[PDB]
Design a protein around this ligand. Structure first.
Ligand SMILES: Nc1ncnc2c1ncn2[C@@H]1O[C@H](COP(=O)(O)OP(=O)(O)OC[C@H]2O[C@H](O)[C@H](O)[C@@H]2O)[C@@H](O)[C@H]1O
Ligand SMILES: Nc1ncnc2c1ncn2[C@@H]1O[C@H](COP(=O)(O)OP(=O)(O)OC[C@H]2O[C@H](O)[C@H](O)[C@@H]2O)[C@@H](O)[C@H]1O
Ligand SMILES: Oc1ccc(/C=C\c2cc(O)cc(O)c2)cc1
Ligand SMILES: Oc1ccc(/C=C\c2cc(O)cc(O)c2)cc1
Ligand SMILES: [Cl-]
Ligand SMILES: [Cl-]
Ligand SMILES: [Cl-]
Ligand SMILES: [Cl-]
Ligand SMILES: [Cl-]
Ligand SMILES: [Cl-]
Ligand SMILES: [Zn+2]
Ligand SMILES: [Zn+2]
Lengths: 277, 282
């Protein structure tokens, strides 16, 4: 279960402020920006992470229990989830790679054709026969790609299965392939609340480094790949992302409740870019 | 500070099965529709879903301290967003279904949600609020006032005064603010419905205010994951996440939960907005 319960790092405010301006600078200059997210971007909605001070695995190692302040169904997308919605909407996010099974990116209204859900989604079941996916309003009741008890309704009666990978299960080929292509082709990869400890998910941001790409890591704890980052920001991702959006001249949009967007809409207008050099 | 009785910490959580939860939220809807004067009492449990830990929960400040462990914050107080529950309370006031709001929370989230300060009793103070010792003018800051226990913050009153500004955060020995307690008590006594949300009700007198509503035939509803001091006196106890309860409630009452435009201070309640017609009940 990897390195659990590592101490947190807090950049002092002055340093925190300068690094967020540097991130702004990087977003403005990059043609292709890919965001990698993990459990840390949902901690501010009451969903514990895995390896943080009170993470699932960290609490288990100490003979304690993780604490949920929400159900998966009653969780609201964080300020960070909604910033990513807007960043995609105005063309500043090329693609979004997530390790999270908590369903919050989809329910935020983030376009599924710009999202790799590497470890699956608790609300998503898949027909074994035709591979048609169903995005449900409640958590699918099983994990480990098991029979849910429901049947495909495609004009098929195929066995529906959860999309939650067990330890032995290889990542979905479609999601990993698009995630890998996005990462290789990106000139900026930004990581938000992941420790980058899982192979290959944790390694995707490193692929951006190939052919001169830039890596930014936003995380309260040290990550597996700190050494490879051009910029490491140690603070709460919500604070980092609200400062970034303010610098970029972008509103964080209202969440109208759980909404599924299959396909990315045409790009909205965005502010003009500052002079940088 | 050190010997201070911190009460019953870390009691087991109780979860109503979904059918019972759904039935009880419909009963709560029935009570709200029938009540002339509805008063909400909130504590630390309504902020857990924004990453601020409570005091007496499984992972609360005092519970964790008892076991030699630390509470965990997933936000700063300045970056915390009001929960679905905070914003539901905003709307319930706006459509005239909330008479008054009594809070033990120092986390600044009611004010910052845009809830009107003239319908809010902040019994234990507010981390973002400093007060002039000379003229009692309050200042609602964008960042936390850096001191606790009614201490000198280092800033001076700007009223057309130069009075010493002090934090509004009570220490253990400090009595409640007289204005906030007085209005909270009056609200509570005169209410025919008190709804408690995410408080264990263990603090005197804050936790006792909801019992005052029971006087002259009032009804008490307690929403809480743990047992509370006054469970025996409740007409209705709901054991679930306050966000689930309040979203289902708003749905039943035909109310949208409004957008948070970011931290906004409202000094005075605005005129009442339209609300849905009431169902036939009896
Ligand atoms: N608000 C916050 N702001 C910034 N960082 C945060 C915050 N909250 C927590 N963190 C950090 O966020 C980091 C979360 O790292 P991990 O807990 O490993 O989550 P993963 O998504 O990378 O786990 C990958 C898979 O492993 C599992 O087996 C599952 O299959 C997962 O899908 C921590 O370092 C915190 O310091
Ligand atoms: N999401 C949730 N949904 C429902 N209940 C919840 C949730 N999260 C927590 N709870 C419950 O929320 C309850 C929180 O109770 P306590 O932790 O005693 O907070 P207080 O506000 O009453 O503390 C009063 C004062 O004492 C202090 O010294 C300070 O002065 C405080 O101002 C728990 O029983 C949880 O089960
Ligand atoms: O890979 C995984 C598959 C299933 C789960 C299950 C629950 C869970 C627990 C958390 O604290 C966060 C989360 O998002 C989900 C977790 C990881
Ligand atoms: O009465 C009080 C005075 C000061 C404080 C300080 C911090 C604090 C800790 C929490 O976990 C929640 C909260 O809202 C505030 C807490 C209570
Ligand atoms: Cl526990
Ligand atoms: Cl739990
Ligand atoms: Cl759930
Ligand atoms: Cl701890
Ligand atoms: Cl803070
Ligand atoms: Cl209004
Ligand atoms: Zn099928
Ligand atoms: Zn003054």
């Amino acid at each position: 279960k990897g390195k659990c319960g590592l101490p947190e790092i807090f950049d002092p405010p002055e340093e925190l402020e300068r690094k967020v301006w540097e991130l702004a600078r990087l977003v403005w200059q990059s043609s292709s920006v890919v965001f990698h997210t993990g459990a840390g971007i949902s901690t501010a909605s009451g969903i514990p992470d895995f390896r943080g001070p009170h993470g699932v695995w960290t609490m288990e190692e100490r003979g304690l229990a993780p604490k949920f302040d929400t159900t998966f169904e009653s969780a609201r997308p964080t300020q960070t989830h909604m910033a990513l919605v807007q960043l995609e909407r105005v063309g500043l996010l090329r693609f979004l790679v997530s390790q999270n099974v908590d369903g919050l990116h989809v329910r935020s209204g983030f376009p599924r054709d710009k999202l790799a859900e590497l470890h699956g989604n608790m609300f998503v079941e898949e027909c074994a026969k035709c591979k048609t996916q169903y995005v449900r309003d409640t958590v699918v009741g099983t994990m480990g790609l098991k029979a849910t008890g429901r049947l495909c309704t495609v004009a098929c009666r195929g066995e529906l299965r959860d999309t939650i990978l067990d330890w032995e299960d290889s990542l979905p080929d479609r999601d990993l392939a698009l995630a890998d292509e996005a990462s290789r082709n990106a000139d900026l990869s930004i990581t938000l609340g992941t420790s980058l400890q899982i192979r290959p998910s944790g390694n995707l941001p490193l692929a951006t480094k190939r052919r001169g790409g830039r890596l930014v890591i936003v995380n309260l704890q040290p990550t597996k790949h700190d050494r490879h980052a051009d910029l490491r920001i140690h603070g709460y991702v919500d604070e980092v992302m609200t400062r970034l959006m303010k610098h970029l001249g972008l509103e964080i949009p209202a969440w109208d409740g759980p909404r599924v967007l299959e396909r990315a809409l045409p790009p909205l207008p965005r502010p003009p870019t500052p002079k940088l050099e």
